[PDB]
Structures are given as structure tokens and as C-alpha cells.
């Protein structure tokens, strides 16, 4: 139908506008310490501790799928990222400190990015 396909262009400029946001939130990781998944190999119970791991990486593959309907869903994969962190690592390590800054700063960045969603709809 017509309606499917106006439908998918919206879902298609959605996330055009969701990539330029993850470049923007990603840019204030200067460190690249929430760019790639929490290594099981690595930290080996990690799971037992968090139980929906996330990163910059994985929120990539989703929405080069199309797979964010609404900047809700996005936002709720970048506050994981965020909120993970802030639990597995105590307040004076880098990591945590790391996800402290990147909240603070990606803050501003969300702000503006809702008001483009509902302003182009």
C-alpha cells in the first residue's frame, strides 16, 4: 500500500535523524569506553549483575535495522548504557565517572532531538 510505504519513509527519516544523534552522543565518549559490548571473557559474571547489557555498538546494528520505532526506544538503549555502568562500577572509578559525563552531556543533545521528532513529526 501507498499508507506502508509513507509509513516506512517516516521509520527511514526517524532514523536518519536516530544516527546523527548516536554521533553526537558517542562524540562526548571520547575514551570509547561505552563503544563496544562488556567482554564475558573479560568480566566473567558481568551477567549475574546486569541483566540487559548494552553499547554504543549493539544500539548501531538496531538501528541500521530500522529496529527504533520512536526516540523513546532509543533513549531507553542509551539510558542502559548509562545505567549499567553507573551500578557494576563504584563512584570513584573512571567508568562510572565516564557515564556521569556522558548523561550530563548527551542531555542537551536528547533535548533537541525531541523537539525535531515532533516538530518534522
Excluded: W
Aim: proline content about 3%; overall charge negative; aromatic content about 8%.
Amino acid at each position: 500500500s501507498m499508507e506502508q510505504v509513507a509509513m516506512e519513509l517516516r521509520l527511514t527519516e526517524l532514523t536518519r535523524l536516530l544516527r546523527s544523534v548516536l554521533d553526537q552522543l558517542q562524540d562526548k565518549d571520547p575514551a570509547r569506553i561505552f563503544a563496544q559490548p562488556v567482554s564475558l571473557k573479560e568480566v566473567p559474571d558481568y551477567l549475574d549483575h546486569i541483566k540487559h547489557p548494552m553499547d554504543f555498538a549493539t544500539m548501531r546494528k538496531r538501528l541500521e535495522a530500522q529496529g527504533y520505532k520512536n526516540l523513546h526506544e532509543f533513549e531507553e538503549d542509551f539510558d542502559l548504557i548509562i545505567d549499567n555502568c553507573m551500578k557494576y562500577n563504584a563512584r570513584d572509578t573512571v567508568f562510572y565517572r565516564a557515564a556521569v559525563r556522558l548523561r550530563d552531556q548527551g542531555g542537551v543533545v536528547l533535548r533537541q532531538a525531541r523537539r525535531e521528532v515532533d516538530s518534522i513529526g
